[PDB]
Every structure is written in C-alpha cells, then in structure tokens.
Amino acid sequence: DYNGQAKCMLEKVGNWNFDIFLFDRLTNGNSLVSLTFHLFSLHGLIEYFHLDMMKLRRFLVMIQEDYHSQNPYHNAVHAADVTQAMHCYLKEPKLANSVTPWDILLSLIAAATHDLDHPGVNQPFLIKTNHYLATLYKNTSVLENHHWRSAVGLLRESGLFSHLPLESRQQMETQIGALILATDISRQNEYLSLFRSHLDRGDLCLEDTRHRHLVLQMALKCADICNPCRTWELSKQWSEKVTEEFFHQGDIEKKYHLGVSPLCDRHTESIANIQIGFMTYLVEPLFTEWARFSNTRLSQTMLGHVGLNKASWKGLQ
Numbered sequence: 001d002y003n004g005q006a007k008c009m010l011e012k013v014g015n016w017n018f019d020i021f022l023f024d025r026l027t028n029g030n031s032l033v034s035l036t037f038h039l040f041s042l043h044g045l046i047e048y049f050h051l052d053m054m055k056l057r058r059f060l061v062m063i064q065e066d067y068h069s070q071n072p073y074h075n076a077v078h079a080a081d082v083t084q085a086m087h088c089y090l091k092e093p094k095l096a097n098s099v100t101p102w103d104i105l106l107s108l109i110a111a112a113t114h115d116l117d118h119p120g121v122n123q124p125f126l127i128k129t130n131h132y133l134a135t136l137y138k139n140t141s142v143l144e145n146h147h148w149r150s151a152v153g154l155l156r157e158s159g160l161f162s163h164l165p166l167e168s169r170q171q172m173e174t175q176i177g178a179l180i181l182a183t184d185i186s187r188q189n190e191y192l193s194l195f196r197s198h199l200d201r202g203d204l205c206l207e208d209t210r211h212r213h214l215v216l217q218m219a220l221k222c223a224d225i226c227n228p229c230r231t232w233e234l235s236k237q238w239s240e241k242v243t244e245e246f247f248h249q250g251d252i253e254k255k256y257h258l259g260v261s262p263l264c265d266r267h268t269e270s271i272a273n274i275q276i277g278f279m280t281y282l283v284e285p286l287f288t289e290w291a292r293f294s295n296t297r298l299s300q301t302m303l304g305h306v307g308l309n310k311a312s313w314k315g316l317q
C-alpha cells in the first residue's frame, strides 16, 4: 500500500518540491536505495553498463546501512536528498546535453556516498580529540577522504563493476573521489573562485571532460547545501535537523572541556543567526554563480526560496 504510494512519488522525482521525508517514511527508511535504484533505471544505466540488478541493490543497501541513522542530519536521508537534487541538476540543459552515461553514473554514486559513515562531528573536533581518521588523512579533508575511501571499499566489495576493465574501475574511484572531496565546505572559496573565473572568461567547454567535471563538482556542492533553496516546509525541517546535530557536538565539547566549536553552542548561538549566516555567506554566493552558468527557471526558483526562507528566519526575531 504505502509501497504503491512510493512508486507514484517517483513519477515526480524530477520535481524540486519532491518530499524526501515522506518518501523515506513510506519506504520504511529505504529512501536512498529506492530512489537511487530508480534513477539508475531512469537514466538507463543498468542497460548502458550491463549491470547485475542483484549486485546493484546489494551495493546501494551497503551504502544506505553504512550511514548513521542516529545522526539527526548526516544520515541516509540527507544522502538521498542530495542525490535527488543532483538528478535535477543533471536534467538542466547544459549538463543534459553534454554528460555521458558514465558521468551520470559517477555523479549519482558520488551523491549517494558523499557523507558515508559520517560520525556526526566535524573535522576540527576529530583533530583536537586525536581521532584515528585525522591521523590517517593528515588533518586534510578528513571527513571527505573518509567518505571517499569508504565508498571505494563498498564499490570493490559489491563487485558491481567487476566486468569492466581494472583501469575503468580505478578511474571511477578517482573521479568519484574528486567529486566527494569538492564537498569539503572549508574549501568552498577555492572551488567558487575557480568557477567564477571560468564564468567571467566564458571559456567553459562542456565537451571537455575536465571542464564538465568541474561543473559536476559545483553541481554536487550545490546539491549538498541546497536545503535553503527548497520550499520553506522542507527547508525548515532541514534547518532544525542540522542545528540539532551541531548542538549535540557542542554539548559533548562543553561536557568534556574540549572548547565549543563555531555554530555548536546552543547557549550563545541562535538557530536563526546560524541559518541566516549560512544562507548569506555560503548558499547565496554559490547559487548566484550557478545561476550564471545555468540561467534557468530552476536556478531562479532556488535563489527565490533562499531569499524567502532567509527572510522568514529574520522574522522569527
């Protein structure tokens, strides 16, 4: 019954107003698997790459179950949301007319696995508490490298692409890594500045693989922080969840005298100001540049929502 209602929702998987929260409830927590499998079929990837559907479901389940459902924000639903957004971006004219099945395959896998096995705390926390991951990745994009190598592990274990040449599997791992690493927010200035420069010069050639993947990396960055670009009813829920996670880290830091990280103090930092600052300094700059690249109704709709939602938070003051 609810399963049948889930199928109908997927008919509008391309809508910016898709409700991932409802979709996950109807599928009993199977949103990432159900949505991603559907997108693989929709984009013809199963046929294009001669995929074994049994291995595909196993791979997707491995990913989904390796997310910590106990995290209020960084869980499989966030991953499914990012994947759904990435799908909407792949439908944008400039990408739709240039991406290959291989690019779509990598983009969706990257989106689905970009926060894999996230512990619910940030890089600075891992570094100051001497977590083994901080040592392993030399305090550099610690979380993102962890998500990437975790994804590589699942790719190899599932054998989903065992029929393709070794070189292809190795390239897949590298390109997915480039996509996942671009989601390290601490490096947004580097990616945004580069994207902005290319747009200023107007020299982006989408038939060039390197230029196209820079665009895909920017698309995934957009997908990762597009919560404020969704309609208020969805955006509001995302804001409460991410703040809940931040404040929980802050509670740990306070309890163990670790020093409270920025945006994590529930006693001195307002959820309203956290959201407003995030929208003003990180979201709007990125989506404004994205709008220059893809000057469509979707880009204007997303910017419109940030403006409204931003105003709503200021109003709640």
Ligand SMILES: CC(C)Cn1c(=O)n(C)c(=O)c2nc[nH]c21
Pocket: 185, 224, 225, 227, 239, 242, 263, 274, 275, 278
């Ligand atoms: C820290 C990182 C998850 C980026 N980030 C953030 O800083 N704020 C404030 C958000 O609301 C938010 N929502 C998604 N990502 C977010």
Ligand SMILES: [Mg+2]
Pocket: 114, 115, 143, 183
């Ligand atoms: Mg991340």
Ligand SMILES: [Zn+2]
Pocket: 078, 082, 114, 115, 183, 224
């Ligand atoms: Zn994310």
